[PDB]
Amino acid sequence: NLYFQSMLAIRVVAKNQVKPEKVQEFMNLCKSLIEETLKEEGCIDYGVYQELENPEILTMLEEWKDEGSLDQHIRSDHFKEIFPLLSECLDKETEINIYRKK
Amino acid sequence: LYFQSMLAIRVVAKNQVKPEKVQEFMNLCKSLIEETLKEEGCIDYGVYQELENPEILTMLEEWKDEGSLDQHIRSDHFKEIFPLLSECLDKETEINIYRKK
């Protein structure tokens, strides 16, 4: 049933604020992270997006089959290696929210 | 279309709902979704609840282009329901518009 899936699907919004100097380096790190992550079981969509009038606000938008998939994502090798690098690029701590459809 | 997706515009509308106001909010979202899905340019629209926090209710959306979204926030149902939605909030609703990179 595609309703049941609808109800267990997870979406994360991961909003980053980036150091103007570190943008190119940030982007190169997302490139590898997307390639890897798109190959995982449960990844429905995963992309990085930029707020319109704000070139340095760069958000991660994802959808995962379910909660345990997201759980494998953050326990994965690539996440583990790239997350810390990605974090050196930021003005502030990344602000993350995990949602479900109501 | 991978290409649609590539030009689509996404919005994250974060609302802090008042604990008691939550159910009026949702009945208001019901009609809002209903009319909005009937709109052209609207790929995906839905209200989501934050897992940690049952008061945070966000609108996640995908539009074929800016123009479509301009129409949407000018529609009758948007103009009719949006102000009623804000009756329910603790802050002004926090809106972000995104373009894929």
State residue A29 phi and psi, 5-degree precision: -75, -45
Structural class in CATH, domain A1-102? alpha beta
Q: Which fold has domain B1-101?
A: Alpha-Beta Plaits (3.30.70)
Resolution (A): 2.7
Minimal Cβ distance to A11: which of B57, B60, B97? B60
What are residue A65's phi and psi, to 5 degrees?
Answer: -55, -35
Neighbours of B35 (CB within 10 A): 15
Residue A90, token pair as written in the block? 């930021």
Question: Nearest Cα to A42, choosing from A71, A13, A14, A15?
Answer: A71
Q: Let me know: does B36 contact B77? Beta carbons within 8 Å.
A: yes
Please give the sequence-ordered ranges of beta strands (E in DSSP) within A1-102, or none if there are none: 10-17, 43-51, 54-64, 95-101
From chain B, pick out residues whose CB is under 8 angstroms from the CB of A99: 48-51, 58, 60
Q: In what helix (H) or strand (E) does residue A41 lie, and over which residues does it extend?
A: none
Give backbone dihedrals phi and psi of B3, rounded to 5 degrees, phi first.
-80, -40
A11 touches chain B (CB under 8 A): yes
